[PDB]
């Protein structure tokens, strides 16, 4: 079966796209070199069309099904929920695509009747309806990014469906594919960890092994691998759970009309063609992937005949470590893992690695690097190549964008050299220029949309990377390369430039008192030579972070609050 089949028509888009970077005193002051930075539009869809279309040939086998039948059987524990109306209402993002028949986002999340007689239209069109296909939109993304002389990226690929079938997936799903995964998955789960977590985790099953070796697997384009079998099974496995009987009707009809696949329309209303393989834009995208790449991998290990493997799986990102066998053999079993995946329906892009050390494994773009606290103790953290964050950053200073990529590498990469002395430095900066220092941001973790108030920052970094954040020095000589190359690159001032700012934004914000002071004091300390006591943030504590790191949702529509 073809991923997809194409028309001829055209991928459209619904507004002007901006292309390169624009000239703003303020994104200038950040990187200069504005050429450099570029967003994607639909001018290249054909491009990434003809990328993500081929043939899948799958072959399961024994290793396989053993490993199916376990997931099942984790599955048939859990207990998944109903949301009414007005729960999945809720969770709409503010700026999620309008529907179709006459209403937006807004009216959605006010509860307004005409959304409402809608969604419960579409509701009953599901109880009701268990095989038409279901109609989706097909877009191009618009992401920023530094060339890199192919030169440009061709823009993403977008597949969701409408607005009134996007609140009824949360109806019958949402509590699924929140509980499910983790349940299934157990410690190999990668969105149930805070980055703290996630590099414990990396750290201890690195530490763990007699001699270990690691790896990245890069599936290429693995939406596109996942087959209508492969969707069928995770329908299956949805329906281990014990649910409410309206939900089980409303899962299969989702599955059979919108899962599995259906057609694309363009934003002119024309038909592109047809889709065989993942949605990239539904409820279960995060869930279904990574239930689909954990099983195929735990799988393969089997196959591959590696030793003692602990997995990571976050969607399409599969990291394992295991036992080293020796080099050639490590190398053999690798080779024989690749294989297993692409009988699978999964072979990949670049072909994996064996790696020796555990900083040169990439995972969800980042890898492990070590710095050290005041007491010259190691400190492990993620770190990541700040180019693409840079980048969107300048964007995210000259243009207001729904959704701000800043605040989540902020959170995500706070211990990080770059984010501390470059992103803090520079957001603090422009928010007290624009007096917006107390207005909340949307941002995303784990591909959840959150609205978040930047004078917060200090006690989530501290839930997140520990006390530690706000102390870090003597960074990994490779990773101060690899910063110095990026702002060399992008026009970006060097950071003795950036310490010297930071120096003005930290009084600025001592001198407003309460939690900006908080900010200053904490996020700021590394800018002075005589250093403030950091001890425990009393806000970290009574911090509600329930739900940030439960599940991905990227894609999914979510938003939380
Ligand atoms: C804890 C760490 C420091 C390392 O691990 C991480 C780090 C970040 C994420 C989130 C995120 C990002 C950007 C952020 C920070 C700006 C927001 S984020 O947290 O949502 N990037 C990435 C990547 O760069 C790469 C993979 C996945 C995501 N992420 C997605 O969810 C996601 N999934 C899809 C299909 O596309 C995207 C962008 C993650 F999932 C894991």
């Not at 597949?159 to 594919?177: I, S, T």
């Not at 609205?451 to 970094?461: A, C, F, G, N, V």
């Amino acid at each position: 079966s073809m991923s997809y089949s194409w028309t001829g028509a055209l991928v459209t888009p619904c507004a002007a796209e901006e292309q390169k970077l624009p000239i703003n005193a303020l994104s200038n002051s950040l990187l200069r070199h504005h050429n450099m930075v570029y967003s994607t539009t639909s001018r290249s869809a054909c491009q990434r069309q003809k990328k993500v279309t081929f043939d899948r040939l799958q072959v399961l086998d024994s290793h396989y099904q053993d490993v199916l039948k376990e997931v099942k059987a984790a599955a048939s524990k859990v207990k998944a929920n109903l949301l009414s109306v007005e729960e999945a209402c809720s969770l709409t993002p503010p700026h999620s695509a309008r529907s179709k028949f006459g209403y937006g986002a807004k009216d959605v999340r006010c509860h307004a009747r005409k959304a409402v007689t809608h969604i419960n239209s579409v509701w009953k069109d599901l109880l009701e309806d268990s095989v038409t296909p279901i109609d989706t939109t097909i877009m191009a993304k618009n992401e920023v990014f530094c060339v890199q002389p192919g030169g440009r990226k061709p823009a993403r690929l977008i597949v969701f469906p409408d607005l009134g079938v996007r609140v009824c997936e949360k109806m019958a799903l949402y509590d699924v594919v929140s509980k499910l995964p983790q349940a299934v998955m157990g410690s190999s789960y990668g969105f149930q960890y805070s980055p703290g977590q996630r590099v414990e985790f990396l750290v201890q099953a690195w530490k763990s092994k007699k001699s270990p070796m690691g790896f990245s697997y890069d599936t290429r384009c693995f939406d596109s691998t996942v087959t209508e079998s492969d969707i069928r099974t995770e329908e299956a496995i949805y329906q281990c759970c014990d649910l409410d009987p309206q939900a089980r009707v409303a899962i299969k009809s989702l599955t059979e009309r919108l899962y599995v696949g259906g057609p694309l329309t363009n934003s002119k209303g024309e038909n592109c063609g047809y889709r065989r393989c993942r949605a990239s834009g539904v409820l279960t995208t995060s869930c279904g992937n990574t239930l689909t790449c954990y099983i195929k991998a735990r799988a393969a290990c089997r196959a591959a005949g590696l030793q003692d493997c602990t997995m990571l799986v976050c969607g399409d990102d599969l990291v394992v470590i295991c036992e080293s066998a020796g080099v050639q053999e490590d190398a053999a079993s690798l080779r024989a893992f690749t294989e297993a995946m692409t009988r699978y329906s999964a072979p990949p892009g670049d072909p994996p690695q064996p790696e020796y050390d555990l900083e040169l494994i990439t995972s969800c773009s980042s890898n492990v690097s070590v710095a050290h606290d005041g007491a010259g103790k190691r400190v492990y953290y993620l770190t990541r190549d700040p180019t693409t964050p840079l980048a969107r950053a300048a964007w995210e200073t000259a243009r207001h964008t729904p959704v701000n990529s800043w605040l989540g590498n902020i959170i995500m990469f706070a211990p990080t050299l770059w984010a501390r002395m470059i992103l803090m430095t520079h957001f603090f900066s422009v928010l007290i220029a624009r007096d917006q220092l107390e207005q909340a941001l949307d941002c995303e973790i784990y591909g959840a949309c959150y609205s978040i108030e930047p004078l917060d920052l200090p006690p989530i970094i501290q839930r997140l990377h520990g006390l530690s954040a706000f102390s870090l020095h003597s960074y990994s000589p490779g990773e101060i390369n690899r910063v110095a190359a990026c702002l060399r690159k992008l026009g970006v001032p060097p950071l003795r430039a950036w310490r010297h700012r930071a120096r003005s934004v930290r009084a600025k914000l001592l001198s407003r008192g309460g939690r900006a002071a908080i900010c200053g004091k904490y996020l700021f300390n590394w800018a002075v030579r005589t250093k403030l006591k950091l001890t425990p943030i009393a806000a970290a504590g009574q911090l509600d972070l329930s739900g940030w790191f439960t599940a991905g949702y990227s894609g999914g529509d979510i938003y939380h609050s």
